A paper describes a structure:
Laser parameters for photoactivation are systematically explored, and time-resolved structures over timescales ranging from 100 µs to 1.4 s using synchrotron and XFEL beamlines are described. We have demonstrated a sample and time efficient approach using fixed targets to carry out time-resolved [name] and SFX experiments with an NO photocage over the microsecond to second time regimes.
Prior to utilizing the NO cage to characterize NO binding, we sought to obtain suitable control structures including both the ground state of the proteins (ligand free) and a ‘dark’ structure where the NO cage compound had been soaked into crystals but not activated by the laser pulse. McCP-β occurs within the methano­trophic Methyl­ococcus capsulatus (Bath) together with a homologous cytochrome P460 enzyme that oxidizes hydroxyl­amine with NO as a reaction intermediate. Possible roles for McCP-β include NO buffering to mediate toxicity/stress or transport between different enzymes that interact with NO. Firstly, upon NO binding, a vacant coordination position on the distal face of the heme iron becomes occupied, resulting in unambiguous electron density changes.
Numbering used by the authors:
A (entry chain A): 2 to 138
B (entry chain B): 3 to 138
Write the structure that this text describes.
């Protein structure tokens, strides 16, 4: 394709982890909100300490939140980030293709530079195949 | 008579999450970052059917650490469990309530047959005693 596929049905995949990024954290833009990480079956193989098969997809699902009496509550989806494994097609950015969908909508693709900008930051995790998230129990 | 420990619950569908911080009314026992998981049968009730027997919902509660204005997940504090069985759990509206300390099967937390859990969940009689709603 050259392009990353919209990950249909990502919401029924394995929930890896969540984190909250609030105002004042260095990454308030653009990663401010509650985010959840999801992984398909092939991605779990790579997360477990296996290698990542082609077809492995990880999803960053980012929500705005609202403060409600000492509770942070999920608001609207801001975007999904998608990493799709293909050693051959996405060799230019380390075997992963990078894409963002605005509000998680399939038409609102965000990345304009082949994912160089995305890769630039993930290149730090060379040791773990460009993935920050770690599996927890 | 007892709620079964929900083996494999971490591979279930993630319904939603929420953060309860110090000061919230529910701070104990429920303070922390929590995620709600549902088995296949519980998804039927969530998308608007009746909840069939065998439906299980799970409240998975982690501590968090605040680090330069990020909330990072720490250790699992407990899980809350609702298990649907109209016959066995008639006394608590057809749901069995149980708490597992640290998410370990040995550490049962409920000592009043679920009455305490049931008293608050009863506000949501209209939606079969469930607070969580499905979101996209
Ligand atoms: C640093 C300045 C980043 C840039 C630019 C991008 N991402 Fe990244 N990403 C970053 C972090 C710190 C994390 C981990 C968050 C956590 O909760 O641990 C992530 C995570 C992802 C993931 C999930 C898988 C993983 O590597 O943990 C995906 C799918 C992802 N990011 C995609 C992505 C895309 C598409 C980006 C450009 C549009 C992008 N990221 C930029 C840090 C940084
Ligand atoms: C009053 C306040 C209570 C009490 C005493 C208990 N819970 Fe229940 N609970 C409450 C709320 C407001 C929520 C919703 C959280 C959210 O929207 O993110 C929940 C949720 C659960 C869930 C998830 C399913 C659901 O949304 O109904 C479970 C499985 C659950 N709670 C279990 C549970 C158990 C076992 C309790 C006694 C040990 C218990 N709860 C008490 C509010 C309240
Ligand atoms: Zn207050
Ligand atoms: Zn803070």
């Amino acid at each position: 394709a050259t392009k990353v596929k919209y990950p249909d049905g990502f919401r029924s995949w394995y929930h890896v982890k969540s984190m909250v990024i609030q105002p004042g954290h260095p990454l308030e833009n653009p990663f401010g909100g509650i985010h959840h990480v999801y992984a398909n079956a092939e991605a779990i193989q790579g997360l477990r300490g296996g290698n990542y098969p082609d077809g492995a997809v990880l999803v960053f699902d980012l929500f705005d939140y609202q403060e409600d009496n000492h509770a942070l509550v999920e608001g609207k989806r801001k975007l999904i980030g998608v990493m799709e494994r293909d050693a051959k097609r996405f060799s230019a950015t380390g075997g992963w293709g990078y894409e963002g969908f605005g509000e998680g909508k399939p038409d609102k693709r965000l990345v304009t530079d082949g994912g160089q900008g995305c890769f630039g930051c993930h290149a730090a995790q060379k040791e773990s195949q460009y993935v920050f998230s770690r599996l927890r129990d």
